């Protein structure tokens, strides 16, 4: 059941708390928290192959992966990492991340398309879980 589409954010929970764990400067946190409620997300899914574009005025990223194959992306705070996505269930994928260089909080993300048509993203750093909920444009 396919996640392709243009998605608009409706709620963002614990994003500032996540940025705190990641050590992001407070003045930057305020800007990023504001931008998080205005983001645009585009997904192109063909089976296990994904393209994801996340766009805001301060931050934009493009993610490319196939489920089950290691790939490179960045942590939320911008550090290059090695990632691997697996299906946890029919509708929900989970990504484990490992920094290329250095140490820091354990980070991961999940993405799920629900029965009622919401896309739910979670992003985790150590004990803090941020949840962002999207609906189709
Ligand atoms: C599967 C969906 C993924 C992996 C989405 C990742 C989205 C981000 C890493 C978003 C990051 C943002 C910032 C770093 C600051 C501006 C607000 C966000 C939420 C767009």
Curated annotation (Swiss-Prot):
Annotated all-trans-retinoate binding sites: 132-134
Similarity comment: Belongs to the calycin superfamily. Fatty-acid binding protein (FABP) family.
The keyword Ubl conjugation belongs to this UniProt entry's keyword annotation: yes
Source organism of this protein record: Homo sapiens (Human)
Sequence position, cross-link Glycyl lysine isopeptide (Lys-Gly) (interchain with G-Cter in SUMO): 101
Name by which UniProt lists this protein: Cellular retinoic acid-binding protein 2
Entry-linked SUPFAM superfamilies: Lipocalins
Keywords of this entry: Cytoplasm, Endoplasmic reticulum, Isopeptide bond, Nucleus, Retinol-binding, Transport, Ubl conjugation, Vitamin A
Induction: By retinoic acid.
Main location per the UniProt record: cytoplasm
Region forming the signal peptide: none
Role description: Transports retinoic acid to the nucleus. Regulates the access of retinoic acid to the nuclear retinoic acid receptors.
Entry's Gene Ontology cellular component terms: cytoplasm; cytosol; endoplasmic reticulum; extracellular exosome; nucleoplasm; nucleus
Any GO BP annotation: fatty acid transport
GO terms of molecular function: cyclin binding; fatty acid binding; retinal binding; retinoic acid binding; retinoid binding; retinol binding
Free-text domain note: Forms a beta-barrel structure that accommodates hydrophobic ligands in its interior.
Assembly information from the UniProt record: Interacts with RXR and RARA. Interacts with importin alpha.
Post-translational modification: Sumoylated in response to retinoic acid binding, sumoylation is critical for dissociation from ER and subsequent nuclear translocation.
PROSITE patterns in the cross-refs: FABP
Keyword presence, Nucleus: yes
